[PDB]
Amino acid sequence: LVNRRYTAKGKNLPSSPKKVRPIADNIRGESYIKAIAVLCSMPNKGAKLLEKVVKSAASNAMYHNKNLSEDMIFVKTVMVDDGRRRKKIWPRARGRADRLVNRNCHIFVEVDEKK
RNA sequence: CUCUCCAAGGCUAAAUACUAGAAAGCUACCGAUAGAGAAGAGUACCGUGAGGGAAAGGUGAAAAGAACCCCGGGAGGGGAG
Known part of the structure; x- marks a missing residue:
């Protein structure tokens, strides 16, 4: 579907x-x-x-379509997926430890010439 | 009774048992949670100490590892190769 240009x-x-x-x-x-x-x-x-x-x-x-200015463009689709995770330790009482996940995201945006 | 042997001295190879290992091989043995704990290791880490003890392999046929341009502080991406 994507016009990856x-x-x-x-x-x-x-x-x-x-x-x-x-x-x-x-x-x-x-x-x-x-x-x-x-x-x-x-x-x-x-x-x-x-x-x-x-x-x-x-x-x-x-850049790829020189005759397209900032005011004919509309944000056609927007996708936000999840990315790598990193685990670090958060220490608590009585010697108990917990793992403390850090998440990242992928972001995909496609614009298109307005209606 | 008869029959066998000659202690209170000392030696003796081979047939036997074993392979941490060195060389050459075989496999209805394993193919990365398997196979040695370890394809990178008794390392990281844990314990005062004796000691306990992991995880992590794969671009392509050859780096020929993206000249250059564009957005962005970078990262990352969009073209060109």
Whole structure:
């Protein structure tokens, strides 16, 4: 399905997919300007990560299609998958130890020329 | 009774038992949770000490390891090779 000419992919980003998915929901299908404004405004780590990926995707589309400006582009699809995990130890009382997982996420954004 | 042997001195190879190992091989033996604990090891780590004791193999036929350009602080990705 993907026009892989027009897309950006960010692998192993430092956030959990459970925390990045809602921000993706708020910009799926929006216009590029509106999405960029939302991601700049909202003060979430996932918001910043999506901002970088979305800007890169728009940049790729513009570079390969010179007659496409910032205001004919809309964020067609947005996917947020889960990535590698790292386990570190959190020690507790009575010699008990717990393992403390750190999750990463993959982010895939494709933009497309507006309707 | 008869029959056998000559102690209170000392020696003796081979047939026998064994392979940590060195050389050459065989396998209705294993093919990475298997096979030695260990394909990288008595290492990491644990205990004052004696001692206990892991996990982790695979690009391609050849690095020919991505010149260069673009987004990005990088990472990562999109082209070109």
